[PDB]
Design a binder for these strands. Structure first.
Ligand SMILES: [Zn+2]
Ligand SMILES: [Zn+2]
Ligand SMILES: [Zn+2]
Lengths: 49, 827
DNA sequence: CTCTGAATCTCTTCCGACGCGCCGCGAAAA
RNA sequence: UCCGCGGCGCG
DNA sequence: TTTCATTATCGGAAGAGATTCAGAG
């Protein structure tokens, strides 16, 4: 329970929905990222990526 | 770092490690771990202490604690500060001292702590206000240990020379035997006093029955000694007028007993469950290790406050107020009791039935001792009849109190002073003052503790040693003194009076306390002791005429030696009591080594006779012609039986009697002949002690060895000249038995050198091996690592296997024989 | 052929704008 | 109740 | 050969160290 709760609450892949407009919700739900655990980092990201 | 704590009992350790958890490493010594193995160097080497060199000693790890001591050494590095937590008494103090000298290190690395109880309120205070080991206490124990050593290793040899080989003497051992010897002589020399009793059945003015006992005649205790006198009295009582004189009603009380200390537990188990001392301790041991009760070895009947609140709490909920006393019952390790009062015997389904019975005994004693007493209304009726006085006593239970938890397994009719009684019948009864009861195992222990003779952890051990040594024997769960016991007891009392005095231990304890309290120095105390002892020993060594211990004394008798017909005499050896032919004392030319075994007639006390049973046993004995002493009885032929006086050999009376008798021919150990299944029996001769089989068609004989009951079988022996011995100049021979197949040295009783064979060895001498053994030579000679392989017996499966060792440890590789093939793998 | 000195490689060490809004999280001990 | 971190957006 | 009692089973650049190769005697 603790691990699941902390994952759903604190992971950088658990973003805070903005819900300004319906399109905002859609574009945030369909967002794809290469960040998070197992991914890249902003500094290490080369120009090629 | 991590702290290392050391206690004596493993069970107690596991329990301590709990109420302390990790960060600490608790372990147990499981006992002592170390002990002992003008002047004579050999004697000193044997004793392990030098009385002539300021008591320098030579301690050495017990042949069965190697592992135990070794694990502490590796574990000691991890521990920062070592905490010796053995018992506070001198024995425990000494175990701590030995641990500290076997583990090494620096004094500051050691600390001494004492655990009150298991409660955290104790295991905590343990490390709170600790201390270090006390030297005075340690030296006090060394003094006791050394005095016991000197006596045993210096007196026994004297016995070997004057009396017989294999004999022993000891501070505790020898007085235990003396007690049995004195009771034996007491029984044999006694004389029953026939006495009569008369009871009268009567009717009250109402019509109720009233039984009366005659107590006085002409104001003198009524006690006729014969039938004639009993009749003279009955004649008068038959015509007398009976009237009530007094009726004394009075409230009387009774009380539960104390919880069972090791000694009392043994006695209670013996009286209520028929358990022998050793058995009782075995069951108690199981119960302790399973956490149901506390330490099976204790001399204190004390109870902690928690224990007392726990039981009162239980009594309160299960019996009510009338059973709970206003305040805890008072009375003069802790006492043996259940670890949890809420646990009933019936719920221990993981224990044997007998262990449940023992638990129930311990439980009930613990709750009763805290329960209320049994109130009774006792009535005593006094009756007059002519010049006679008669009495009747009754009792009616009013309140069970403590007997509610510990049950054991009377109504006098209403009559007032002055009332007349009607005589119905008079019943005379003949009786015989009975001899003192014979000792039992628990009963002797009780006597020992009463005189402070032994120790809780040694009582059982004492009872066995005196039997194995042949001094006394047990029959019908009762002790009987053997002739040898009497012989040794008389010799020891003659030359070592001080040592044979019952209070020698008490006197020793006083001197030991003085050493423990800086009121005396230990070496000085041992020096005084040794001076007195040597004065007695030297005097005993001399010839009987100079006051020297009397050597044995053949007492002849009219019997025909089957080898030479001569008169035969009665003799005592460490093996027992036996019939010998005087040619034993004649040089070889005229020497006769024929001997006869003397089967005694075992006294069979009738439990149904109660107190009579011992008296009738004394009545059963013949009486010696030359003296009043009773006589003890032995069987020499199915046609002949032999009587011998109690004071033999001081008294020389003997009697021989004819009749038809079930003579067994032997007495001592039992062994089953592997070659014919018959009984096999233990025998003595020019080579000491051998073991030989009763079937006349079979002469198969085994033999005694240093540290076991009997050798394995003398079957299919094959000699090898080409294997030399290494500790001795001998050569090695190959032998088979239940133990296995083994190499042993041709002068075996002298060399006593044995080792398992290697496979390569067998292969080298494979032509010699009998047809069956050949398979072992087929076995793989070397393991996959190229280590070398040895031939072992798997006792659990009664088969040979081959196994390899490196640095003397097992490699963990084994090969076995399975259907004509040899199959190999990790152990 | 063997050693010493300089080059080359391998490993270690630094450092990668600047403001400013938001959001939601952190730690328990017996 | 003063702190740090993670993400998002603005230039 | 042998006796006693007791106790309890990112990538790029710079710097320092280590290793190797070429030149001399
Ligand atoms: Zn003879
Ligand atoms: Zn006599
Ligand atoms: Zn046989």
């Amino acid at each position: 329970s603790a691990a699941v709760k902390e994952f759903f609450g604190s992971s950088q892949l658990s973003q805070f929905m903005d819900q300004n407009n319906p399109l905002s919700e859609i574009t945030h739900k369909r967002r794809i990222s290469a960040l998070g655990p197992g991914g890249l980092t902003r500094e290490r990201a080369g120009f090629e990526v | 770092g991590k702290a290392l704590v050391i206690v004596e009992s493993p069970a107690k350790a596991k329990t301590i490690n709990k109420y302390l958890g990790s960060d600490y490493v608790v372990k147990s010594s499981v006992g002592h771990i170390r002990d002992l193995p003008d002047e004579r160097g050999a004697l000193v080497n044997r004793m392990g202490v030098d009385p002539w060199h300021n008591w320098e000693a030579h301690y050495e790890v017990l042949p069965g604690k190697e592992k135990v001591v070794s694990e502490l050494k590796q574990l000691a590095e991890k521990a920062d500060h070592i905490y010796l937590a053995t018992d506070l008494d001198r024995e425990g103090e000494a175990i701590a001292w030995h641990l500290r000298e076997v583990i090494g290190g620096d004094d500051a690395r050691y600390s001494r702590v004492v655990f009150n109880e298991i409660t955290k309120n104790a295991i905590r205070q343990a490390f709170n206000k600790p201390g270090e080991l006390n030297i005075d206490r340690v030296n006090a124990q060394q003094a006791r240990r050394f005095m016991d050593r000197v006596v045993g290793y210096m007196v026994s040899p004297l016995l070997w020379k004057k009396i017989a080989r294999g004999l022993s003497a000891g501070r505790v051992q020898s007085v235990a035997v003396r007690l049995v010897v004195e009771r034996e002589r007491e029984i044999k020399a006694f004389v029953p006093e026939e006495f009569w009793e008369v009871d009268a059945s009567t009717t009250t003015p109402s019509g109720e029955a009233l039984a009366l006992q005659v107590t006085h005649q002409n104001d003198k205790p009524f006690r006729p000694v014969n039938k004639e006198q009993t009749q003279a009295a009955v004649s008068l009582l038959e015509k007398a007028r009976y009237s009530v004189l007094e009726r004394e009603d009075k409230p009387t009380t009774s009380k539960p007993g104390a919880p069972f200390i090791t000694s009392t537990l043994q006695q209670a188990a013996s009286t209520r469950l028929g358990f022998g001392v050793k058995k009782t301790m075995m069951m108690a041991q199981r119960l302790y290790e399973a956490g149901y009760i506390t330490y099976m070895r204790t001399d204190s009947t004390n109870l902690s406050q928690d224990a007392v609140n726990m039981v009162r709490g239980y009594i309160s909920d299960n019996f009510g107020k009338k059973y709970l006393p206003e305040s805890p019952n008072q009375y003069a390790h802790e006492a043996i009791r259940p670890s949890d009062v809420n646990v009933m015997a019936e719920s221990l389904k993981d224990m044997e039935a007998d262990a449940q019975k023992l638990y129930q005994l311990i439980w009930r004693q613990f709750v009763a001792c805290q329960m209320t007493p049994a109130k009774y209304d006792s009535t005593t009726l006094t009756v007059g009849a002519g010049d006679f006085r008669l009495k009747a006593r009754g009792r009616i239970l009013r309140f069970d109190g403590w007997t509610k938890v510990m049950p054991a397994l009377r109504i006098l009719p209403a009559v007032n002073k002055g009332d007349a009684l009607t005589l119905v019948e008079l019943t005379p009864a003949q009786h015989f003052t009975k001899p003192p009861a014979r000792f039992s195992e628990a009963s002797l222990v009780k006597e020992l503790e009463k005189r402070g003779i032994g120790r809780p952890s040694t009582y059982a051990s004492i009872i066995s040693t005196i039997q194995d040594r042949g001094y006394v024997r047990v029959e019908n769960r009762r002790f009987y003194a053997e002739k040898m016991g009497e012989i040794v007891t008389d010799r020891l009392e003659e030359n070592f009076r001080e040592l044979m005095n019952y209070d020698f231990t008490a006197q020793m304890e006083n001197s030991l306390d003085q050493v423990a309290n800086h009121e005396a120095e230990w070496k000085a105390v041992l020096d005084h002791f040794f001076s007195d002892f040597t004065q007695q020993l030297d005097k005993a060594e001399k010839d009987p005429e100079e006051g020297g211990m009397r050597p044995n004394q053949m007492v002849l008798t009219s019997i025909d030696c089957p080898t030479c017909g001569r008169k035969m005499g009665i003799r005592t050896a460490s093996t027992g009591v036996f019939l010998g032919c005087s040619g034993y004392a004649l040089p070889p030319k005229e020497r006769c080594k024929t001997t006869i075994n003397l089967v005694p007639e075992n006294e069979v006390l009738n439990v149904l006779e109660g107190e009579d049973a011992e008296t009738n046993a004394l009545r059963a004995k013949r009486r010696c012609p030359k003296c009043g002493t009773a006589m003890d009885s032995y069987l020499i032929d199915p046609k002949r039986k032999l009587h011998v006086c109690g004071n033999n050999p001081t008294c020389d009376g003997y009697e021989i009697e004819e009749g038809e008798f079930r003579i067994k021919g032997y007495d001592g150990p039992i062994v089953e002949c592997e070659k014919c299944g018959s009984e096999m029996h233990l025998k003595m001769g020019r080579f000491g002690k051998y073991m030989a089989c009763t079937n006349e068609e079979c002469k198969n004989t085994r033999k005694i060895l240093r540290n076991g009951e009997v050798a394995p079988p003398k079957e299919d022996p094959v000699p090898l000249p080409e294997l030399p011995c290494e500790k001795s100049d001998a050569y090695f021979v190959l032998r088979d038995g239940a133990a296995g197949v083994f190499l042993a040295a041709n002068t075996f009783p002298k060399s006593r050198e044995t080792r398992a064979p290697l496979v390569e060895e067998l292969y080298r001498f494979r032509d010699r091996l009998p047809e069956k053994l050949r398979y072992l030579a087929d076995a793989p000679q070397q393991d996959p690592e190229g280590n070398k392989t040895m031939v072992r017996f798997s006792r659990k499966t009664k088969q040979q296997y081959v196994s390899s060792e490196k640095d003397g440890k097992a490699t963990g590789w084994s090969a076995f024989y399975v259907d004509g093939k040899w199959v190999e793998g990790k152990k």
